[PDB]
Amino acid sequence: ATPWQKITQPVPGSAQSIGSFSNGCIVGADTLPIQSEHYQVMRTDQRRYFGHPDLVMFIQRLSSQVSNLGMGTVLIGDMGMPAGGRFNGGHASHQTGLDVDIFLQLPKTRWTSAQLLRPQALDLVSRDGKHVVSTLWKPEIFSLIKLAAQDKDVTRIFVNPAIKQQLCLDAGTDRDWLRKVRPWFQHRAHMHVRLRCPADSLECEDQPLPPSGDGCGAELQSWFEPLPPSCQALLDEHVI
Template sequence: MLRTIITGLMLACISQSVMATPWEKVKNPSQGDSSSIGSYANGCLAGGERLPLQGDGYQVIRSERGRYYGNSEMIVFLQQLMKQSQQLKIGNVLVGDIAMPRGGRFSSGHASHQTGLDADIWLRIPEKPLSPQALKTVSALPMVDVKNYKIIEKNWSMKQAQLIQLAASDDRVSRIFVHPVIKQQLCKTQWKQRDWLRKVRPWFGHYYHFHVRLKCPEGSTTCKPQTPPPAGDGCGTELASWSPNYKAPVKTELVIKVKPKPKQVKVLPPMCTMVLKS
C-alpha cells in the first residue's frame, strides 16, 4: 500500500515536471530594469521585482508557487493599495498570483498574468494578519452562489466593495475582472462617484477574488496595451447579458452567417526568447 502511494506521488511529480512550461522552470528574474514585453496573454517580464511576502496591510498566499513577481509598477501599486486599505481599516488583504519570475506562459491556471501587470486579490479579508500556519491552510471565501447566480450576503460586505473601488479608482489601473454577480452588486450600491465602475469588467470564474490589470507603464515601448473599456458604467444591458436568464432581443433583419476564422497560434515576441535564456 505504502509503495503504491509513493509510486503515485512520484508519477504525479514527473507528470507535472513534463507538463511545465519553460517559464515555470525558471526560479529567478532576469537582470536589468523592469520591462513588460508583449501582451497580457502573450508576453513575458524582464527585470521582474519580488513583492515582499508580508507588508503593511497584506500577506502573499500560496507563496510556494513563486508567483509573486511583477513589473516594478505593479509592485509599487500593490504596496500603495494595501497601505491605503489599512488606513481605511478595510482589513488584512491576501494577495494571490501576480506572475512568475520572468512572466510567460503557464501550463494551467492562467491565460494572462504573463507580463507582470496582472494580480489576483482575494475577497476573503481577515481583520488581522494570519499566523504562518493559518496562511498555509487558508481557503478562498466565495462571494457568489454560482448555481443560483446571486451574491452570498453573509460573505459580502462593504469592505470588499471599498477595496475594489479603491483599486479601480487608481489611474494606473486598466481593468478589474470580477464575477458578473459581483459587478451587479457594485452597480446596485450608491456611490458618490461612479466613473471607476467602467473599469470593473464582468468575467466568470472571479467569484472569490478580483483580478487587477494595470495599463502599460508610461513610456514603455515593449508592452502591448489593451483597448480601453467601453464608455459608461457597464451596469445596463451589457451586464444583464451575462445572466443565464437573459433573453436577447429578437432580430428581424436578415442575418448572414460568417464562417469563423481559424484561431491563430500565438507567437511570443522575439525579446522573450532572450529574457528566458539570459
C-alpha cells in the first residue's frame, strides 16, 4: 500500500488539485457530508468521499436540483482518497479530487447503512449491449445525467454507449450537452462525472475538449462494432 492509500485525513492547506486525473494528488481536500436530505453515500468504509471543494459543491448542487424536480435520492460512489492519488483496486483516475461515480438509480426510499455498504447495481443495458432496457429506462435518469452535463464545472460524463444512445434519442432540440457524454466500457449502472480543473489549482492539468458536436453519430456507432513534482514533495516532506 502507498502512503496515499493509508492516509485517513486530508492534507491541511489551501485546496489544490495537483496533476492530471490519472496521475496526481490533492492538498486541502474537502469531505462530503454523509448526512444530506438529497443524497446518500455508498461504501464509506473505503474512505473515498473526499475531493476538491468544487466537487463537493457540485454534488450538493446536482442533488438539490434532482430533489426539487421531485425525484428520488442521489447515490454517491467513489470520489477520492483524502489526499488523492491512485486507488488500490481498479481504475486509475480519481487522483485529483475532481471525479465522482454516481449510481444510475434514484430510490424513493432511502437506503439503509447495509445497502449503502453493499450497494446493489441495476444494469440499465441489454445483455448484448446494443440498447437500454426499455422497461428500466426512466425520464428521471435522463434528467439526472442531463442536469449533471449542463453544469458549467463538468467536462465529461462516462456512460455505457447504449446509455449515450438513448440520451441522444431523448434530447430533442436542447442537445449540446451531449458532447460532454463520453461512451465507455461498462458504466451500465453508474456514470462517472469529471470536473474541470479549479480556477486556482495552477498545477492541475485539464484535458482538451471532446470532439465537436453531440457525438451521437459516427463515434457512437464505432462503439457498437512518476508523480507530479509537487505531489512527490509531500512525501519528501513527510506529510502523507
